[PDB]
Design a protein around this ligand. Structure first.
Ligand SMILES: *[C@@H]1O[C@H](CO)[C@@H](O[C@@H]2O[C@H](CO)[C@@H](O[C@@H]3O[C@H](CO)[C@@H](O)[C@H](O[C@H]4O[C@H](CO)[C@@H](O)[C@H](O)[C@@H]4O)[C@@H]3O)[C@H](O)[C@H]2NC(C)=O)[C@H](O)[C@H]1NC(C)=O
Ligand SMILES: *[C@@H]1O[C@H](CO)[C@@H](O[C@@H]2O[C@H](CO)[C@@H](O)[C@H](O)[C@H]2NC(C)=O)[C@H](O)[C@H]1NC(C)=O
Ligand SMILES: *[C@@H]1O[C@H](CO)[C@@H](O[C@@H]2O[C@H](CO)[C@@H](O)[C@H](O)[C@H]2NC(C)=O)[C@H](O)[C@H]1NC(C)=O
Ligand SMILES: *[C@@H]1O[C@H](CO)[C@@H](O)[C@H](O)[C@H]1NC(C)=O
Ligand SMILES: *[C@@H]1O[C@H](CO)[C@@H](O)[C@H](O)[C@H]1NC(C)=O
Ligand SMILES: *[C@@H]1O[C@H](CO)[C@@H](O)[C@H](O)[C@H]1NC(C)=O
Ligand SMILES: *[C@@H]1O[C@H](CO)[C@@H](O)[C@H](O)[C@H]1NC(C)=O
Ligand SMILES: *[C@@H]1O[C@H](CO)[C@@H](O)[C@H](O)[C@H]1NC(C)=O
Ligand SMILES: *[C@@H]1O[C@H](CO)[C@@H](O)[C@H](O)[C@H]1NC(C)=O
Ligand SMILES: *[C@@H]1O[C@H](CO)[C@@H](O)[C@H](O)[C@H]1NC(C)=O
Ligand SMILES: *[C@@H]1O[C@H](CO)[C@@H](O)[C@H](O)[C@H]1NC(C)=O
Ligand SMILES: *[C@@H]1O[C@H](CO)[C@@H](O)[C@H](O)[C@H]1NC(C)=O
Ligand SMILES: *[C@@H]1O[C@H](CO)[C@@H](O)[C@H](O)[C@H]1NC(C)=O
Ligand SMILES: *[C@@H]1O[C@H](CO)[C@@H](O)[C@H](O)[C@H]1NC(C)=O
Ligand SMILES: *[C@@H]1O[C@H](CO)[C@@H](O)[C@H](O)[C@H]1NC(C)=O
Ligand SMILES: *[C@@H]1O[C@H](CO)[C@@H](O)[C@H](O)[C@H]1NC(C)=O
Ligand SMILES: *[C@@H]1O[C@H](CO)[C@@H](O)[C@H](O)[C@H]1NC(C)=O
Ligand SMILES: *[C@@H]1O[C@H](CO)[C@@H](O)[C@H](O)[C@H]1NC(C)=O
Ligand SMILES: *[C@@H]1O[C@H](CO)[C@@H](O)[C@H](O)[C@H]1NC(C)=O
Ligand SMILES: *[C@@H]1O[C@H](CO)[C@@H](O)[C@H](O)[C@H]1NC(C)=O
Ligand SMILES: *[C@@H]1O[C@H](CO)[C@@H](O)[C@H](O)[C@H]1NC(C)=O
Ligand SMILES: *[C@@H]1O[C@H](CO)[C@@H](O)[C@H](O)[C@H]1NC(C)=O
Ligand SMILES: *[C@@H]1O[C@H](CO)[C@@H](O)[C@H](O)[C@H]1NC(C)=O
Ligand SMILES: *[C@@H]1O[C@H](CO)[C@@H](O)[C@H](O)[C@H]1NC(C)=O
Ligand SMILES: *[C@@H]1O[C@H](CO)[C@@H](O)[C@H](O)[C@H]1NC(C)=O
Ligand SMILES: *[C@@H]1O[C@H](CO)[C@@H](O)[C@H](O)[C@H]1NC(C)=O
Ligand SMILES: *[C@@H]1O[C@H](CO)[C@@H](O)[C@H](O)[C@H]1NC(C)=O
Lengths: 119, 434, 119, 119, 48, 37
């Protein structure tokens, strides 16, 4: 169900992303609400685009983990914490992570162009 | 050994009911929220495609009347409201010595009328038709609108000439055109073509006879929801036009006055020539041929041994019992008594016409409009391209019927259907993903 | 032309998908109609996304054909049927296929993530 | 900055595509303006999709340059000309390139489908 | 301008003055004719 | 009117009284582009 995994651990919750994603699209003020929802959806799709993640729900990238953002171990993060707790844990670093992802994808695309140029 | 393959852009569609766009290349029908039409409209014939069409369940008729009524009201609202005209009238006969059919039709009525200054009043005299002014008890009369509704004065600068209006599909939707001669408005159509937008449809307002409509080239087409159910109307699409010349021969004077700050009332003045009744000239030979084609099609539907009779409307209001039409802002009502007077067992007809200055369009009660007068003598020429018939056991008697504009619009929209595109689909293929 | 292949065989009609794709996008109710068209387009694009087909008109998956949905051979389906007839014949199965496609993409994404995790 | 590289050479300006991509998504007439902006964005994304570029910002294709569109050498184009001048220079050829890109992608997708069909 | 009297001059049901019987000139369908009309009002709506 | 006088607007239109609670002092207005422009 929608948000059914919200209280589950991050690992278990990672298996329910499809239902939550599919329910994101589902006088003047309601039309404004529909337009705003579309704009937010497209903002998320464009953010995935500039990172090279537009084609999938789970997209691995080439940006390493800083460890200053959070020093919890992998097992702790995925098996003990919930996604709300994780969001709080790194709420101060989102604008840095997104910028690094943007730079990484830009370098990846330029590298692909240079590799394709080889005869 | 087969796997699912997903195709996006698949030419499949479902029946749909959605909002259509206005397209059109002052007039009451002019629409600001309307786009110029395509200079080169596209039509794509669909080969080997047969699809069921149903004019009776077509959802574009509802949009047609909703758009026409809303546009009408929006155009009429920003005009002078004649609140101080619902007053007591003291009337006499305009021309008491006439012996023509206009005897008693026009009355000369006096009333005290408010002026721009609240302190001052002005007696006014004007002429009205006998159908707008009704006796209360010279004689005293009142305007009929006072019985049910207030009057808005239509802006004299606004023209009523029908402008063809195109209805265009929204993106993701398409309009299919049957384009099949002798199609009776229902069932499979093997000649379906895809159009982005329809041709122009004029908002022609009439009853009993369908004016300025499409012609059925192959033959007269008889359309009904149930051809043996006498509660439904029969819509007849002709294969030949019938030219009709209608006129208001009197040379009428037009006067205007100011009734309040920025408000003015326009009214019928004296007559500048001999008083003559409005009438319509219909060729008898052309009508005779039209009757022959309609009768043979009715025999085909009801049996070749049936006697067919045409008669005048048995009852209802003037909008139902008589033919009605608009010419240049003037609203004419004509008897048609000489058109539906015949029994079939197996050079020019003049129809009297009456003028009503105050009308109630689209069967709406509680709203009314006062048309402005028009100067001089008006003549208009139009084509009759269809008929409305209603059926009453040896002899089947038919009458004009009518009275519902949604049938007049359906008689034009019967060829089009709205569908929604379903671009996604699946099919088996011999293909696996990595 | 737009829907010109609607009466053509499925095989021939598969080569015209570009035209319909471009023709899906081309006063309060006019704005509402445009918003609804956008919502339907986005629902279809998201549905392709969850299937891993966001960038393609034709994409293959790993979901097998049940054969109970339709036991026609490929020659009969592709040469002797129109897309309208095919759509009618599987009208009772479409949502089942959609569910299977979503599950298949979820398994592919998790397996891809695990393969990428190997050094 | 938004359009900060607009006056830069095409080569230098190619490194700021993400600034424009991010910023382009930043009473009834205002809602109409927002909906039209969304429709233009979606038409551009659909146009990239039909070409098979998915979410890539720099998309390399299989369509050769004809040299009749512009006979400048690569160095002159990228180092001594701006994007405004270049776009004006080839304004008469854009729809031809777009048609070639759509045809090339349709052939590529059919070839990929046939390759996947091989056991 | 409203002209009112006591609808029920004698009653001890705590309504002795709650309902007034009022008359007024009013207007009519035609602007030239006025119609005097009588109707009842509550004391909470009508004030002297 | 032709002492007896009338308001200058009487022969043009009805005149609306502006609400006295609404100030007419100009406020600088900034025009902003929609997204995409
Ligand atoms: C079916 O179609 C026919 C073909 O158009 C249509 O007949 C046309 O009707 C219009 C509207 O009455 C005619 O246009 C008028 O013609 C008169 C001729 O005397 C002109 O004077 C009119 O202009 C005056 O009025 C205008 C305001 O209405 C003013 O703005 C203008 O300055 C003039 O004062 C106007 O042009 C048209 O001429 C005829 N067609 C022909 C060939 O005569 C018919 O009415 C349609 N059927 C129905 C039921 O409407
Ligand atoms: C309507 O009736 C009035 C009253 O009779 C007409 O006005 C009078 O017309 C006569 C000649 O017909 C004049 O001698 C009077 O002086 C007029 N009096 C007024 C007050 O106008 C009026 O003309 C009639 N309406 C029409 C259109 O003829
Ligand atoms: C309809 O037909 C009648 C006659 O059939 C026409 O009436 C004639 O009109 C002219 C016009 O100047 C007169 O000179 C004749 O004296 C009239 N004769 C008769 C017998 O009425 C009438 O004008 C026609 N109307 C239209 C609109 O065509
Ligand atoms: C809540 O915690 C309990 C503890 O074992 C767990 O069993 C349960 O599944 C958790 N809720 C969800 C939604 O995962
Ligand atoms: C971790 O973040 C700090 C922030 O100041 C930065 O200085 C450091 O280089 C980062 N380390 C890595 C490995 O990214
Ligand atoms: C990971 O963090 C949790 C948090 O309590 C701790 O219990 C666990 O021992 C840690 N594991 C490692 C390997 O650091
Ligand atoms: C975010 O920063 C604020 C101070 O700027 C600090 O109080 C808060 O604890 C920080 N939260 C996280 C999750 O780093
Ligand atoms: C206009 O008002 C006067 C007032 O005395 C009245 O005598 C006259 O009959 C009124 N006019 C009409 C047409 O009723
Ligand atoms: C007013 O409307 C009623 C409604 O039927 C009608 O009977 C009556 O005759 C109308 N008044 C006049 C004067 O005709
Ligand atoms: C219309 O024509 C079709 C032709 O087969 C027929 O089946 C159908 O009953 C007809 N319907 C009417 C209302 O005439
Ligand atoms: C059509 O009208 C006839 C007339 O009696 C009736 O018997 C028949 O049931 C009607 N059919 C439909 C579908 O309305
Ligand atoms: C209508 O008027 C035209 C004008 O020339 C005339 O030719 C035509 O015959 C008239 N219509 C009829 C039915 O007489
Ligand atoms: C047409 O006119 C002739 C004149 O003799 C008449 O016999 C015939 O019945 C008429 N046809 C129709 C359909 O009225
Ligand atoms: C039409 O003419 C007939 C002839 O008898 C008459 O009875 C009928 O009342 C007329 N209709 C109108 C509306 O005058
Ligand atoms: C109606 O038809 C009859 C013949 O049945 C005829 O005598 C009568 O005059 C006709 N009336 C009209 C108005 O055409
Ligand atoms: C009708 O009256 C007007 C008024 O000036 C005049 O110009 C016009 O010629 C008249 N027409 C006829 C047919 O008498
Ligand atoms: C009436 O029909 C004739 C038939 O040739 C056509 O030429 C004319 O344009 C038509 N007029 C209208 C107004 O439909
Ligand atoms: C339509 O059917 C005919 C039958 O001979 C066939 O030749 C033609 O190719 C078909 N066209 C389509 C578009 O199905
Ligand atoms: C085919 O569909 C039937 C329907 O019940 C199902 O039982 C069967 O397992 C399916 N087979 C495959 C291979 O999907
Ligand atoms: C496909 O099946 C039909 C009957 O369902 C059969 O007539 C036809 O020969 C089959 N074709 C192939 C290639 O198996
Ligand atoms: C789908 O189910 C309905 C249920 O009555 C049935 O009528 C229809 O034929 C079925 N279609 C298919 C393709 O199974
Ligand atoms: C503008 O031109 C000058 C001329 O040398 C150059 O130094 C500068 O880098 C140029 N800047 C851009 C943004 O093109
Ligand atoms: C290149 O341009 C020439 C100019 O006419 C044209 O004939 C040729 O077909 C073009 N080639 C390509 C691949 O577009
Ligand atoms: C590009 O073309 C210009 C045209 O004169 C020439 O001067 C320049 O040297 C060329 N550069 C290269 C790298 O070919
Ligand atoms: C493009 O066409 C215009 C005229 O429409 C012409 O002036 C211009 O030179 C053309 N440019 C090219 C590069 O063909
Ligand atoms: C009605 O008006 C008359 C004067 O026209 C006045 O004398 C009378 O008191 C009024 N009625 C009421 C109830 O005020
Ligand atoms: C009355 O209206 C006319 C134009 O309709 C205008 O010229 C005149 O000045 C107005 N009267 C006054 C006092 O302004």
């Amino acid at each position: 169900g929608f948000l059914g995994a919200a209280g589950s651990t991050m690992g278990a919750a990672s298996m329910t992303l499809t239902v939550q994603a599919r329910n994101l699209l589902s006088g003047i003020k309601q039309l404004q609400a529909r337009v705003l929802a579309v704009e937010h959806y497209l903002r998320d799709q464009q953010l995935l685009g500039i990172w090279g993640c537009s084609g999938k729900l789970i997209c691995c990238t080439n940006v390493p983990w800083n460890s200053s953002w959070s020093n919890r171990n992998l097992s702790e993060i995925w098996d003990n914490m919930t996604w709300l707790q994780w969001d709080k844990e790194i709420s101060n670093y989102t604008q840095i992570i997104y910028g690094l992802l943007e730079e990484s994808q830009n370098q990846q695309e330029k590298n692909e162009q240079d590799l394709l140029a080889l005869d | 050994n087969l796997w699912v393959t997903v195709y996006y852009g698949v030419p499949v569609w479902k029946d749909a009911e959605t909002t259509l766009f206005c397209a059109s290349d002052h007039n009451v029908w002019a629409t600001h929220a309307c786009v110029p039409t395509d200079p080169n409209p596209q039509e794509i014939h669909l080969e080997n495609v047969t699809e069921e069409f149903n004019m009776w369940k077509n959802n574009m008729v509802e949009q047609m009347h909703e758009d026409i009524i809303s546009l009408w009201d929006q155009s009429l609202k920003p005009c002078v409201k004649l609140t101080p005209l619902c007053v007591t009238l003291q009337c006499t006969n305009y021309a008491p010595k006439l012996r023509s059919m206009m005897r008693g039709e026009i009355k000369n009525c006096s009333f005290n009328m408010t002026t721009e200054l609240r302190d001052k009043k002005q007696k006014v005299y004007s002429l009205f038709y006998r159908l707008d002014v009704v006796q209360i008890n010279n004689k005293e009369y009142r305007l009929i609108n006072c019985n049910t509704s207030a009057i808005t004065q239509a802006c004299p600068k606004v023209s009523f000439e029908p402008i063809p209006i195109h209805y265009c599909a929204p993106a993701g939707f398409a309009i299919l055109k049957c384009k099949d001669k002798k199609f009776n408005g229902t069932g499979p159509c093997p000649s379906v073509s895809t159009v982005q937008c329809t041709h122009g449809i004029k908002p022609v307002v009439s009853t009993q006879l369908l004016l300025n409509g499409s012609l059925a080239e192959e033959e007269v087409i008889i359309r009904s929801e149930n051809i043996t159910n006498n509660a439904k109307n029969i819509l007849v699409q002709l294969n030949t036009p019938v030219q009709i010349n209608c006129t208001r021969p009197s040379n009428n004077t037009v006067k205007s006055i100011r009734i309040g700050p920025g408000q003015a009332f326009y009214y019928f003045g004296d007559v500048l020539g001999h008083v003559r009744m409005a009438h319509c000239n219909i060729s008898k030979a052309t009508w005779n041929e039209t009757l022959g084609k309609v009768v043979k099609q009715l025999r085909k539907h009801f049996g070749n041994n049936t006697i067919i009779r045409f008669a005048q409307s048995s009852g209802g209001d003037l909008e139902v019992t008589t033919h009605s039409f608009n010419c240049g802002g003037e609203f004419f009502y004509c008897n048609t008594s000489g058109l539906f007077n015949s029994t079939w067992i197996s050079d020019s007809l003049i129809l009297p016409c009456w003028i009503k200055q105050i009308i109630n369009m689209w069967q709406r009660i509680g709203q009314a409009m006062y048309a402005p007068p028009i100067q001089g003598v008006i003549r208009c020429v139009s084509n009759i391209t269809g008929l409305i018939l209603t059926r009453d056991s040896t002899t089947e008697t038919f009458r004009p019927g009518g009275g519902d504009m949604r049938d007049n619009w359906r008689s034009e929209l019967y060829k089009y259907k709205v569908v929604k595109i379903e671009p996604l689909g699946v099919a088996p293929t011999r293909c696996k993903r990595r």
